[PDB]
Design a binder for these strands. Structure first.
Length: 115
DNA sequence: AAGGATCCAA
DNA sequence: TTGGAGCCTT
């Protein structure tokens, strides 16, 4: 059901249209949220750095728990995510979320490679 | 400004 | 051996 939407996303025109890791990163998130805004929330409450906070309803909250985190507003959602990270960390975040929303590792790996 | 590999710390 | 983030090329 959800796996379908994601798989459709990677093939979508606008996904292929994003030109940078971040944009693709945002889109995956935006999409994972609209899929199950509920499950997304739970997967989210359990995702954070060793000192940095990753997602938060307000920006200052990200601005308050780390230095030069690049808070960006996840379009379509009530969440903000940090952006000062390498593609490896981005996949790690996506990976953490999808795992929570219990996705097939196969597809999960498929997504990261597109980031 | 912005993105994100690179590099350093824990 | 995972995570932070100043830093320098777009």
């Amino acid at each position: 059901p959800l796996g379908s939407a994601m798989r459709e996303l990677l093939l979508s025109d606008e996904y292929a249209e994003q030109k940078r890791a971040v944009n693709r990163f945002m889109l995956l998130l935006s999409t994972l949220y609209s899929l199950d805004a509920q499950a997304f929330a739970e997967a989210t409450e359990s995702l954070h750095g060793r000192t940095r906070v990753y997602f938060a309803a307000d920006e200052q909250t990200l601005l308050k728990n780390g230095n030069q985190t690049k808070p960006k507003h996840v379009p379509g959602t009530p969440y903000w995510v940090i952006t000062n990270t390498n593609t490896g960390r981005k996949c790690s975040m996506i990976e953490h979320i999808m795992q929570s929303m219990q996705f097939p590792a196969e597809l999960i790996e498929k997504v990261c490679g597109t980031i």
